[model samples]
Target: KFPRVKNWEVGSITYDTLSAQAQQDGPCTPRRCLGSLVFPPEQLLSQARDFINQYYSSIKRSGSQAHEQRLQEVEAEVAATGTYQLRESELVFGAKQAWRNAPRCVGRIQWGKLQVFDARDCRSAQEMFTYICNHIKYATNRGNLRSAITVFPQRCPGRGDFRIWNSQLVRYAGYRQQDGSVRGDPANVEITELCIQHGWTPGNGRFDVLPLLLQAPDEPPELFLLPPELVLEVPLEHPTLEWFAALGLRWYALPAVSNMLLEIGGLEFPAAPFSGWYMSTEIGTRNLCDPHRYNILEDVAVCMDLDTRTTSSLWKDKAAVEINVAVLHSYQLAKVTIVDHHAATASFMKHLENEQKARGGCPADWAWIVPPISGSLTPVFHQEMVNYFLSPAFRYQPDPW
Candidate 1:
């Protein structure tokens, strides 16, 4: 039976037939729904065949001899060497498909527009650093950010994997303080310690960009610092609040996630780092205001001279809005690419409709697809969603020690 979903904001309803097409099972079952939990993060020939077929159909070339010949070539190679490789065009197609199939991404509306930098030729950590630096420069584009992914060599049999040590290409270093508190991003403390153990000199400030830990197969990761100019950051300030700039709040222009594995056509690229522009709420609400993160809500509230003395005062709400406003304003003033939650979620609703028409239904995680703050105000917040896995896809891997 197809799951029926509805948008409470409007009386509209839709049936999710795409969930039936998912080859993998999620945690939910008839007796239980573990839909809200977070952070708990296939086949060769048949998988490749499925991917190749999808690729061919996408270009309106299905059933052509070219498609047939390509399928035969894959079969012949896999049979001869026990594996096969993707053509340059195929890799490009696969990367975009992986993005489109990402259930947790609210920005899948821009999935087709990604720039895929093929870095499969890299064989050394130093060479990988060069590729990474090039990726950062191109995607950053001097604050006019673009969506891109640089895919390293696939995980091959009889060889170790190419891995990135940092979760994002540009995350701040977190130092464990004498008081047992974290100095920078509390989320990145473990990676920071790993960087120190790898002989990196630590920084004492809040927004110090950490160096890249690029590991070639079977080798200890090498440390390389990004040229400071290549990282574009906006010094956050409000449009009218003069004191907001004094808070010394800022964030990087690019949000490049570096550690996730990109799986496509039965091959895995373990060091595929991808970047997209930020949604304002990601920085303002989650990054700055989350208790485990910068925890700046109380500070901002106090600056506003609001009554932080009680939750009933809703000072946190007022502070978070100004921060969100400041994030959007700063990015706009800096001329970096950014989307407010209002625009991002509105675009997502259109993406859902387009996917529904293009395919049978769109797979989405309500917990993730909805913007973190002002939930009830967004179109996605009221929409019931069906969560399922699809491929070619991105999957989380264990951190390299």
Candidate 2:
């Protein structure tokens, strides 16, 4: 029997705590975690295998032919590495009988949804997942991500936001001789390298995805700390470069820098989500993704609007200058969390090249942000923030801001 109902456990299927004592198995693998929640194909195969070996005989004897056939198909899928064709959501439960069409990884996770068929009529307990995955696109709330900063807002000064790279900062230039590749500049190169090595690049645009990168995948990853000598310091730290490197706030600037790149490149859009940036402010272990103690709700939601097509007239006409500017500052904390645990920089850089080629450079519509200071009226939402802001629109719960 299930434990007595409790508020926290009401709708929760699994209860897990990260405490050292609570974890009998070593820290959860990214594959396991993603397979359990975000939908990983290998995990599905393993699950189907387990289900067949454990429950196939019992279900085969049952009077239900549908259930029997379902088991056979699931068994076949588990054998073939073929994607257990299904939605990312269905991945939470497991595969279905018709698991042939589900895409593997959606080629990317930021904007796409996992494909699945409706399983609402499944009388079998396990098959219920088929229903959930199929209808998940409709039932589940897909958060709106910040759109591409394609074009400047009407109130914007000019199409200046498009120019993200201030070549002046190129002073800190350096390239990975190993990969024979050139990064923007020194600070950006380091930040980009660290992000790619640890898989931080996936959540490039919004700073919120930073929290999810703290996990050590198969191996531990390292942070490519900014070189103290490159950046000048406040009067206090001028004498010592080490002290500057230790500056607590320097980390936040890293992600902020990526933010600047994203904003300028018009990549903050759903089409060009933050695939190379990492969260470095009050977040996971090192303030990766969670809210900082100093931030309020409004403070957390302070990113600029970039997707004008989705913008509401209410927030649009409020005068671009009137909008808060501090939140738009370029971030600096570009740390990497790795599964391999090996301190391999090459691996990450390779991944970065793959991503860049996958998504082309900034769209021309947003190319204007490259020059003079512009307006901030592009309507966009952070990955998670999409649901938060849109919820009011749907429920008619008048927005306060």
Candidate 3:
């Protein structure tokens, strides 16, 4: 029998079919259900009440009976139903705080200015697709990318939650060949296969943008195509090296991560897709240089005629620098907003100080704060950071099939 998994929800909630063949086949741990679990009801209620108080305080209405009344309602509701709802103002504040509390993002300075699109009333995959399309258009902003998030309905008991299966709104299709090699982004091989298995037609190229897999309640997931014109991409080229243009590398301008769960005061929005403008190294260094992805460092080094015999030759390092330079330069030539590692890290330091004065501390993951290409070279590498969980946070979640 073919190994299969039943529809799994976030946390430890999963359906596994057991049989004599399954017992012989051994335990199959699902790949996507590998992150933080959902907060229990008691913890959720406390966090919700705290968030309500914070929201009221931020708006100069701290002592108002509205705060007490909201807390009382949440306590009573959670006591009766095991869950509570967040008001509109609370949702806005929570979304911004979620971005601010994102430890993995180096671009948190714009956290307060994020546009939150509340699509909680969406009743089906088709409507969710419409909201996502609008989010893509609004966030892309014709190359002037603005930080934004679109939140779908929250998870509830007995009702299947809404979710986006793709890791990002924009991504390249990956095809596994008979020779066991991948044609496009190898990072997305599993998801690409899942998409094809669900009736999506695979494209035959390097940069095919995958369709959105929108799931609502008990209905089957629906695939929706993103308008080609709405996605902004910059063709990469170096200012000095004409040969760089021949490599034919390009990336989408917006880095909108779609699979993360947005937790606002313990309420989980499983389909909150968020975006920030690209930092050059995220494209040039990791996406292009990581062994599993593009892995073009040697090709670039060969084109530059650098000695590739030894690690001491520093050919890979040289190639990565040029690739990053091309990425920054190309985005500028196309009039798209992009930031170099130096400028981005410097701004991050400023954000750190600002956050310290405002929130007593900033939560930053050191590994993510350090740029992949030049770790020790950037000032952020020396900065001491404490990574901790904060309510109104964005977290990785299980992939919805």
Candidate 4:
């Protein structure tokens, strides 16, 4: 039977449970954790063999002495340690595979070119902070964002795994106003409170970067501040409308997700933070237009002089379109790397076709493949998607309190 539910979101399936002795939140017990998938050893062994073969084949070392030796080494390690460590080549391959198998991402075309920083040897929160700072600097690339991931140590037996408590490396702080209203990013309100509780001094600003909550084994979580230059943000404006610039809206260039757990060969890397360039709809349709977020649809609609009197006018839809257009225009004007949802979804379709040829089939999630706005207008909306478990995959994890 289910215990008392602590928290449950409408779109999510799992319920959160509060346990003082629990390692983390969510519906996980001592025996099992919701969304914490454990693959059978035999299945992992099969995946390891296939990956070894693929690695050898790709590097023109198939059937050679080194290839056979590496395969034997993997087998021996699995027999002795119950798991085999990935080689540098296998780590890179697995990182790319994880990105390619990311169900929620519409930008898989750059999967093969991701720069993976393996920090598996990191043993402290300070080292993780350093790695994250480097990752931000490299990925931001002064506005030309590049897809990248920094993988900290993997989950080990009888150890407290390393984790980043913040949802993203770079995020704006949300301050609770005395009038029962929120300013800045409402999505980060909980995290901002957590940072304050953990002895972080938050600033009052629409664009203040929240401090990082880095947790290491047997150590209290430490807070670290990100360098201002490392985080590249673009000012929002429209090409045709001068008033759009006066709105004083802006967003971070990189959409780096930090709270995701990277699973590879039955091992979960809890501190693997990955990033990709933003799609216009992500910022325009959801972040800016969502009622719980900035919620500027009505203001923008009023600016466009549209009928905001009733729902029949479709004012929100019209405003969303113009806002999306402005988002695209501003990013391009700033020379920042961004993609429109149309092109991104189309490219995802192409990626599926390419994957169908490379692998036997392509795995996708329907809810995420469709664009937030103009869902039916995109080609991916019509196509059915079948999502299943796969190794070397990036997955959502419970938030660390």
Candidate 5:
């Protein structure tokens, strides 16, 4: 049976219009659920929290000097922008960009790629910011990125107070707001909650540009500094700005991950909320922002295969120690079906070609980021920071020697 979801509240911005529906219809996994079946909510929370604290402490202890040094260098570059100055004590990142040389990857049959272009090639960082501030579109997708969607001509959930339940995806986002409240109309309050918990306030002043450099250093420097939504066609120049650009680029990519996640899950694009009735805010000021614009679409999944035959480990002996590294090098997945809602529309014709050659572009690269480590065992940095925390034993074995 199809899982049911809820509708967004009219003028209600708490949940994305669709997710509001999902929350009430079931499939709701309480935040307390915490991804662990063995441990209760309280225990899971404590362990996870403790693990993270130690993980961060270890990184600072081992790399504080280098991090501090890098921060100064980055700050100097920012100061040179002449548009803004880096504040003293502002946290700076020393992320290494290795993906640029890693190759512009193209996924095989199972997983499709998502590409993000720099939209503001012609505008200054200030101008681009202005454009995005006035024109950011909020999107919602069915759970897991695997669900098929049919964009409707009307608005989904109408405009009112509504709740989303049983959803596989939930995102409420917009560009910088004029007020410093860190919330927007139809506020994505949950995202706000996440930012507070992580101590990561989504920067209103183009600070989101950093991760682009963090993830891919090879992008042109000119493209850096501008919002990812704006730099659709330009490249970054200054390596320093590259850092900030990466942040914006990655921020733009996050909201898409949920849907791409559907692709990752090997499911059809699920039916859109109320047949994708909501018009797209991204398309135009005059158009209805018709959800139908996205009607006929496909999903793709690509994975780095880890079978015995395709992947293996490397062993090396140096001094009096032996090191083993696990290698997983495969990318293939199932086909995603693209619905044919608009047989006569022009975009569908172009989409036909996009389907023929599915290079997910930058967004795909951003989503599949594999945190770089020294090898399979040790982190590349002296500090150990992972997407997930580790145990004491894992932390202690610095070099595995």
Candidate 6:
């Protein structure tokens, strides 16, 4: 049976039959629903067979001689060595499908356009650094960011997993200060300390880019500083308020998540770093304004001379809007690619329609699909969503440390 979904605002309903294909169970059961949870695999030969069939079906050549031949080839290799490599074309398809299968991503509309960089041949931390730097340059595109993922070698029986230590490719250092308060991005305090322990000279600024700790199989992670020119950054400034630039606010162009595991046909690429351009709220609201992160709302409100003395004054509301405005304007002034929450949510709504026709349904997480700042103001807020696992998925792995 399909789950019935509805948009509360539009009063339209649809049946999510595609979710029925989910083989694994989620957190919920028949007794109760835990809808507000935020989350956070596998066999080989049988999984490989299923994936190969899916690939053949995708090309409209299911059961053809070529398809059967490829299946036999996989079987022969697995029978001999207990593991088989995916053909280049198969790898490309798997990477794109993984992006499409991600339930938490609101930017799945561009899943098909991803540039998958094959770095499977990389055998050393130094080579991984070179590959990652190239990915940064290509994805940043001098500010017009592109969707990209660099796939390292898949985990094997004899070797330890290749790993990226940082959560994202570009992240600011978070220093634990003497006054007991953290400076920079507090989300990265642990990683920052790790870098320092690894002999990186700490920088004394809020927005210093953290050096990457790239780990080859069965080795300690090596710290590599990103070339300054390859890291594209935009200084935040309000279009109307000239004083906003004095805030010393800035953000990187590409939001590359580095610690994710990319699973394709039961093989896991533990060091696959994927990225895309940012949505404004991701930078302005979540990154800068979240209480645990930068927490700049109160300061921005004071700068704007808003009545921060009371919640009834709506100072927080006013400050958040202006900060989002600053994020949008700054990216535009710097010729960097960025989308506001409105456009991203609208595009997601369109993506829902496209997926409905192409596939039976699209899996989405409501909490993630809705923008953090103005949930109800966006179209996605009113739409009901189903959360389920799909194969060929990007998943969160444990930190390499």
**Which model scores highest in lDDT?**
6
Clashing pairs in 6: none
lDDT of 1 by residue, 197-283 (tens): 888999899988888888989888898988999888899989998998998888999999998999998888989999999999999
- lDDT, candidate 3, 1-401, per-residue tens: 32222212112211111121111121123554312322213777767877787788878888788778888898998899899877887899999988887777898888889898989888998898889889988988888888888989998888888888899999988898989899889989888898898888999888787877888888888888788898889999999999999988899898998899988777888988988899999999989999999899999999999999989999989999999999999999998889999998889978976876676567666778889878777878777665556666787787775
Off by over 4 Å in 5: 1-187, 201-256, 263-344, 349-401
Per-structure clash totals for the candidates? 0, 54, 0, 0, 88, 0
TM-scores of all models?
Answer: 0.98, 0.21, 0.88, 0.85, 0.19, 0.98
lDDT of 6 at 181: 87
**Model 3 stretches with alpha carbons more than 4 Å out:** 1-43, 79-81
Off by over 4 Å in 2: 1-24, 27-46, 50-68, 77-325, 328-401
Which parts of model 4 have CA positions greater than 4 angstroms off? 1-47, 50-67
Predicted candidate 2 versus true structure: per-residue lDDT over 87-141, tens digit per residue: 2332212222111111111111222322223222223212322222223222222
TM for candidate 5 is 0.19
Report the CA-based lDDT of candidate 1 relative to the real structure. 0.90
Candidate 2, poorest ten consecutive residues by summed lDDT:
383-392
Candidate 6 ranges beyond 4 A from true positions = 40-42
Clashing pairs in 4: none
**Ten contiguous residues with the weakest lDDT in model 5:** 323-332
C-alpha local distance difference test of each model: 0.90, 0.24, 0.81, 0.80, 0.21, 0.91
Clashing pairs in 3: none
- Looking at model 1, residue 355 earns an lDDT score of 88
Candidate 4 positional error at 250, Å: 0.9
Off by over 4 Å in 1: none
Sequence-dependent TM-score of model 6: 0.98
